[PDB]
Amino acid sequence: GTIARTIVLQESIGKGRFGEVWRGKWRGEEVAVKIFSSREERSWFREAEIYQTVMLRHENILGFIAADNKDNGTWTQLWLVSDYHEHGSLFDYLNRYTVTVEGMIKLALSTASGLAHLHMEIVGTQGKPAIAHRDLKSKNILVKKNGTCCIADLGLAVRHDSATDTIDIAPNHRVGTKRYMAPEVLDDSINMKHFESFKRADIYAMGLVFWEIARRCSIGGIHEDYQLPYYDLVPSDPSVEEMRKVVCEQKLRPNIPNRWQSCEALRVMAKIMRECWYANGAARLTALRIKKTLSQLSQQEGI
Ligand SMILES: Nc1ccc(Nc2ncnc3c2C(=O)CC=N3)cc1
Numbered sequence: 001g002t003i004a005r006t007i008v009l010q011e012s013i014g015k016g017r018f019g020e021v022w023r024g025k026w027r028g029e030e031v032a033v034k035i036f037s038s039r040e041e042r043s044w045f046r047e048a049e050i051y052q053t054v055m056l057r058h059e060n061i062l063g064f065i066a067a068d069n070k071d072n073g074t075w076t077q078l079w080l081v082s083d084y085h086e087h088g089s090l091f092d093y094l095n096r097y098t099v100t101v102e103g104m105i106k107l108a109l110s111t112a113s114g115l116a117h118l119h120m121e122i123v124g125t126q127g128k129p130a131i132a133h134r135d136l137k138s139k140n141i142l143v144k145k146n147g148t149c150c151i152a153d154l155g156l157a158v159r160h161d162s163a164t165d166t167i168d169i170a171p172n173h174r175v176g177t178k179r180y181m182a183p184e185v186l187d188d189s190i191n192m193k194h195f196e197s198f199k200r201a202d203i204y205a206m207g208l209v210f211w212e213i214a215r216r217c218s219i220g221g222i223h224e225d226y227q228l229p230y231y232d233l234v235p236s237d238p239s240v241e242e243m244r245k246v247v248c249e250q251k252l253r254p255n256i257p258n259r260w261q262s263c264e265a266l267r268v269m270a271k272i273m274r275e276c277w278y279a280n281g282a283a284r285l286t287a288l289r290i291k292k293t294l295s296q297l298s299q300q301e302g303i
Contacts, residue, residue: 004068004079009033013088018043018155023084030084031065035077044078046169047155051080055128060114062142062152082152090149090209091138095226098218101265102303103147107213108269109294110148111141115206116287118151119199121162129168130160132198135176136205138212138228160195167195178243179230180205183279186244190281200281206290207276211254214269222259229254253277268297 007024014021019034036044044067050056051064063083070077087093090107099107115136122128133140133154140153156175159168171192174185182201184190190197208229215224230238232255233246246252256273260266272293275285 001068001070003066003081004070004077007031007033007081019047019080024081026065026081030086032082032084034080034082036080038076038078041078043155044080047080050131050154050157050159051082053128053131053159054126055122056131058114058117060110060148060150061117062150062154085142085144085150087143087145089139090141090143090213093143094138094212094216098216098223099213101217101219101263102301104213104217104269105265105294105298105301105303106147107143107149108210108272109291109298111151111206111209112287112290112294114149114151115202116291118154118157119202119287121160123162130162130195130199131157132160132195133157133202133205134171134198135180136202136209137177137180138209139177141209158195158198165195167193167198171198174240178238178240179228179234180208181240181243181247182281183248184281186240187248197281199286200284203276203284203287203290204281206287207273207284208254210269210273210276211256214260214266214273217266217269219263219266224257248279251279265297265301268293 007026009022009024011023013023018040019036022033024031024033048067065081068079118131121130134156141149142152143149182204185201234242256270260270272290278284
């Protein structure tokens with residue numbers, strides 16, 4: 001179509017489960033293009049559907065431009081065009097850099113603000129359904145030039161119909177990255193007919209991402225090396241069984257260093273992590289509550 005024909009692909013930057021991500025140029029500006037083959041049409045269409053949800057746009061949600069198709073004369077490519085963020089993922093950012101107390105708060109509050117907007121139902125003519133991500137992780141969050149995050153990779157999301165309390169694609173199987181799966185997803189006790197259960201599982205995963213950020217917070221030159229949550233307990237690419245034995249049976253969570261109590265911002269962060277990590281989803285903080293707590297902290301620090 002009219003958009004893809006005017007885009008020039010400059011570099012393939014990532015090759016994932018579904019689709020390949022490229023850095024392209026559109027009307028002189030850098031954009032990201034996720035490309036799917038003809039046999040991945042269902043995944044492409046579902047991601048285009050989620051990104052076109054009414055009232056989705058938010059500073060902490062990846063900005064979607066358009067779906068399109070491009071025929072090179074041999075095969076058709078299915079495209080999803082979105083804003084480009086040079087820093088890439090929060091995972092890449094945390095591996096490359098340490099952050100200040102200000103930096104940590106900015107990354108955490110922006111993530112929580114984006115998740116609170118996804119989770120929020122807006123009632124009305126141009127209403128927004130509540131959405132649960134189902135695959136929140138540091139590799140699925142991007143960092144903007146201004147040091148704030150935006151949630152990306154929304155292709156596995158589910159949307160709620162509040163009038164009937166039903167889910168648009170009626171999920172009946174576990175999806176997502178195994179390392180970030182909530183205890184109830186790992187042991188399959190989650191009620192997949194209950195939308196609020198998917199919101200609570202996203203909060204558990206957000207708590208894990210907060211732990212990744214807080215390790216990289218450098219105060220008086222003291223910080224931890226970058227690690228994925230559970231690096232000390234499971235192998236790379238862990239199985240559901242490996243994760244379940246640690247999270248559900250032994251009931252372990254990532255370690256919270258006692259020295260995080262020595263700094264007020266790290267103390268607030270550690271308390272949020274614990275209150276995201278409860279085995280009972282109903283006891284977890286909401287994204288809106290976390291946004292409120294971190295907003296109070298950002299105001300105190302003068303960010
Ligand atoms: N290492 C690595 C890290 C990140 C990516 N992806 C991206 N990077 C920059 N902007 C983006 C994207 C998207 O995926 C989607 C939209 N905008 C690819 C590879």
